[PDB]
Amino acid sequence: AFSKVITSADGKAAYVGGADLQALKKFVSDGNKRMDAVNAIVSNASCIVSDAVSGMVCENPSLIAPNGGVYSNRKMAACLRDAEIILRYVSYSLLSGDSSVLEDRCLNGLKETYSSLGVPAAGNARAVAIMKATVNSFINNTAQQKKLSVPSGDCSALASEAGGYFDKVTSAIG
Amino acid sequence: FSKVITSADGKAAYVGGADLQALKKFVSDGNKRMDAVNAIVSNASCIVSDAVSGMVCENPSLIAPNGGVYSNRKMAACLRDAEIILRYVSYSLLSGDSSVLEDRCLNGLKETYSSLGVPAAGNARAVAIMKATVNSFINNTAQQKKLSVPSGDCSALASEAGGYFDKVTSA
Amino acid sequence: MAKDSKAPVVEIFDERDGCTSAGSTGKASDAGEKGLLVKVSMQKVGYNAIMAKSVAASYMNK
Amino acid sequence: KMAKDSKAPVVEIFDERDGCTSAGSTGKASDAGEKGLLVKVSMQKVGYNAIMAKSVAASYMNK
Ligand SMILES: *CCC1=C(C)C(=O)N/C1=C\c1[nH]c(/C=C2\N=C(C[C@H]3NC(=O)C([C@H](*)C)=C3C)C(C)=C2CCC(=O)O)c(CCC(=O)O)c1C
Ligand SMILES: *CCC1=C(C)C(=O)N/C1=C\c1[nH]c(/C=C2\N=C(C[C@H]3NC(=O)C([C@H](*)C)=C3C)C(C)=C2CCC(=O)O)c(CCC(=O)O)c1C
Ligand SMILES: *[C@@H](C)[C@H]1/C(=C/c2[nH]c(/C=C3N=C(/C=C4\NC(=O)C(CC)=C4C)C(C)=C\3CCC(=O)O)c(CCC(=O)O)c2C)NC(=O)[C@@H]1C
Ligand SMILES: *[C@@H](C)[C@H]1/C(=C/c2[nH]c(/C=C3N=C(/C=C4\NC(=O)C(CC)=C4C)C(C)=C\3CCC(=O)O)c(CCC(=O)O)c2C)NC(=O)[C@@H]1C
Ligand SMILES: *[C@@H](C)[C@H]1/C(=C/c2[nH]c(/C=C3N=C(/C=C4\NC(=O)C(CC)=C4C)C(C)=C\3CCC(=O)O)c(CCC(=O)O)c2C)NC(=O)[C@@H]1C
Ligand SMILES: *[C@@H](C)[C@H]1/C(=C/c2[nH]c(/C=C3N=C(/C=C4\NC(=O)C(CC)=C4C)C(C)=C\3CCC(=O)O)c(CCC(=O)O)c2C)NC(=O)[C@@H]1C
Ligand SMILES: *[C@H](C)[C@H]1/C(=C/c2[nH]c(/C=C3N=C(/C=C4\NC(=O)C(CC)=C4C)C(C)=C\3CCC(=O)O)c(CCC(=O)O)c2C)NC(=O)[C@@H]1C
Ligand SMILES: CCC1=C(C)/C(=C/C2=NC(=C\c3[nH]c(/C=C4\NC(=O)[C@H](C)[C@H]4CC)c(C)c3CCC(=O)O)/C(CCC(=O)O)=C2C)NC1=O
């Protein structure tokens, strides 16, 4: 059901409830916890992206100076867009339990795209690293300001899995 | 704007060029006023969340069982209303008067809330926190989120916005 | 008062840096005011479950 | 090779078991055995956000 809407890429939604949802959660591992882990990402998407791009810049203000990777509103906006694109492909990898769509539709050829535009790899890797850390805290419900109410228990396998998807991004950025 | 406010159907009015020059000509501090409005509306989600959160943290009886904002349903209605009020205040600052705020948002609101049992002290505090937050954003004195504008003094616009919040509090 | 849950959504546009999109042309004349526009529309303010849940879980954290 | 359309999968998670109901709560999928629960996925273009871009430029030095 999800593969079809990814492949059509036409904006129409797939809705999974009922028996289909019961089956989905038995097919993936840790199914109910996985729903919560996904929500921990997507419900915080704007927070994750803003904080990561902001941290990339605060650690290297050369990025916002003339000739810098995010100088001008145009380039900052493209960078915030990309961070959200990446985050959302990570979120879908966590929903589906694999990275195939992330690797094929988002990452394949991305280093060369960035190289030829001079999108700086160190800043990019750092934005990804900050998103990775932020997502880890949200999945584990250990963020300092925003909390998620869920049944108590352990989500460290899911947190590790999400971290591995970020590592695939890092290894694609080079 | 009066046409789109009265139709209330979602069709937008777009004011540029000579129409925008005229808008600004007939209000005080026209360019600064645009920036002051942006300082509110571009932060609307921040302002509303922080104000309702502060209303509750200072008075958790509001989120006790059967309290004013207990249950997601009631919390969501309260966040909605805080945004409604904030947006009518923002439009008052754009247009330079409170007529639409008073007529479309506030007239009869006291009785509406009293009959639903929506607490007056909680409402007052949410409004007071939004008032303070807006004042900082207009003056660009917030701790985290900043607005880049030409340097100067927006005290008059800040006081005008505060007066619109005072009209809400009175109601 | 109205009872439609609608409020005036004011948007301020300042595109004087030259970054444009499809929406940047055709909505109004720009004579004498390049890159500048005020947009107002009446929109229902919808309930936000994610924010409601967040506030209930997080309000004690400034 | 990667896509070039700026589209990404937008995943939404719905848990309405507290009972709060809206129009969208009904009719989007069968709910048998999973009352109040739904996963939605769609592919959407990620649009530029001028307000956030301007905010980061002005604010990034504040944690
Ligand atoms: C939306 C922001 C947020 C809320 C709300 C919340 O409860 N947690 C939030 C974010 C969050 N951030 C991190 C980790 C980092 N964030 C940054 C960027 C900021 N640090 C700066 O120095 C800076 C410029 C001055 C920033 C902007 C950085 C660098 C990190 C650390 C990354 C790392 O290498 O570990 C987290 C994870 C840690 C935590 O739970 O606090 C979270 C949840
Ligand atoms: C989006 C939030 C925000 C950012 C980002 C930023 O840079 N400034 C922000 C908000 C902001 N808040 C205030 C003022 C108040 N906020 C509260 C609520 C919080 N206080 C609590 O005790 C609490 C629960 C633990 C909260 C949540 C309160 C009470 C105030 C003060 C209201 C008053 O009576 O004066 C401001 C304005 C003050 C400032 O500039 O820091 C701003 C910008
Ligand atoms: C790590 C992510 C955090 C954590 C998670 C956790 N969740 C559960 C149990 C449940 N979670 C759900 C949630 C959903 N199921 C759905 O179908 C949907 C909509 C798509 C959602 C949001 C459900 C239904 C359960 C089952 C129990 C219940 O109904 O309340 C657990 C318990 C263990 C388990 O495997 O069931 C845990 C640990 N908890 C944490 O503390 C981490 C921060
Ligand atoms: C308080 C609000 C803050 C402050 C404001 C401030 N702004 C200006 C000058 C200008 N602001 C604009 C902005 C717009 N005009 C529009 O029509 C629109 C779109 C609807 C916008 C966004 C403009 C055009 C100017 C004129 C200067 C310029 O050409 O850029 C000033 C300068 C004084 C003046 O009145 O012009 C000030 C002080 N400044 C602050 O420091 C407060 C935090
Ligand atoms: C009560 C006011 C609370 C609230 C509810 C609210 N929900 C939505 C949107 C959706 N809810 C669902 C959930 C389902 N649809 C189904 O058919 C099923 C059974 C399988 C479920 C569990 C969905 C799918 C949506 C989105 C619909 C879509 O994609 O078009 C809203 C938004 C408005 C609407 O009615 O669509 C709201 C307001 N929100 C709150 O804040 C209260 C706590
Ligand atoms: C560059 C990529 C930057 C960016 C731009 C951006 N703008 C919009 C939307 C609008 N821009 C305007 C401004 C005008 N329209 C006009 O006709 C005039 C002349 C009078 C101006 C100054 C308007 C009104 C809109 C809204 C359009 C509408 O209501 O339908 C967008 C959104 C997408 C779109 O094209 O509508 C974007 C992305 N955004 C950035 O982040 C970059 C910094
Ligand atoms: C939040 C600070 C406080 C809070 C709010 C709350 N309000 C309601 C219910 C209503 N609010 C309105 C307000 C408007 N409707 C409009 O159309 C407009 C202008 C366009 C406004 C200002 C109305 C009409 C209602 C009743 C109808 C409705 O539900 O939408 C509630 C729900 C109350 C209930 O128990 O049903 C709540 C929770 N509550 C608090 O405790 C805070 C102090
Ligand atoms: C759906 C999958 C998909 C992806 C992944 C994607 C990425 C992508 N990012 C691009 C640009 C860009 N990406 C960035 C991002 C950044 N700059 C920085 O300095 C930071 C390190 C980083 C943010 C963290 C920037 C600034 C550009 C514009 C580069 C330029 O014009 O010079 C481009 C070139 C075309 C364009 O500008 O839109 C592509 C194709 N496009 C897609 O369709």
Residue numbers in the entry:
A (entry chain B): 4 to 177
B (entry chain D): 5 to 175
C (entry chain C): 2 to 63
D (entry chain A): 1 to 63
Text from the published report:
In addition to their membrane‐bound chlorophyll a/c light‐harvesting antenna, the cryptophyte algae have evolved a unique phycobiliprotein antenna system located in the thylakoid lumen. The basic unit of this antenna consists of two copies of an αβ protomer where the α and β subunits scaffold different combinations of a limited number of linear tetrapyrrole chromophores. While the β subunit is highly conserved, encoded by a single plastid gene, the nuclear‐encoded α subunits have evolved diversified multigene families. By careful examination of three newly determined crystal structures in comparison with three previously obtained, we show how the α subunit amino acid sequences control chromophore conformations and hence spectral properties even when the chromophores are identical.
The crystal structure of PC577 from H. pacifica CCMP706 has been determined at 1.0 Å resolution. The structure shows a two‐fold symmetric (αβ)2 complex that adopts the open form quaternary structure which is closest to that of PC612 from H. virescens (RMSD 0.531 Å over 2909 atoms; cf., PE555 from H. andersenii—RMSD 0.670 Å over 2657 atoms). The atomic resolution electron density map shows unequivocally that PC577 has the same chromophores as PC612. The chromophore structures are also near identical with only a slight twist between pyrrole ring C and ring D in the β158 PCB which is quantified by a difference in dihedral angles linking the rings: (−13 ± 6°, +12 ± 1°). The loop protecting the α20 PCB chromophore from the solvent is different in the two structures and it is marked by a distinct sequence in each protein (residues 21–27 following Cys20, which is the covalent chromophore attachment site). In PC577, this segment forms a single helical turn, making multiple hydrogen bonds to the α20 chromophore. Thus, the α20 PCB in PC577 is highly constrained by the protein. The backbone carbonyl group of Gly24 in PC577 forms a hydrogen bond to the nitrogen atom of pyrrole ring D in the α20 chromophore. This results in a −10° rotation of the inner dihedral angle linking ring C to ring D in PC577 when compared to PC612. Thus, the differences in amino acid sequence between the α subunits of PC577 and PC612 are likely to be responsible for the observed spectral differences.
